[PDB]
Amino acid sequence: YTCGPLFQCPAGQYCQDKDGTGYCFKGK
DSSP states (O other), rough: OOSTTTOOOOOTOOEEEEEEEEEEEEEO
């Protein structure tokens, strides 16, 4: 819900849903 196709993380980082928010993590 937080992350999507239009708002995807950069190459190397993935979207993470925490505290009702989305953040990009380097694998972690």
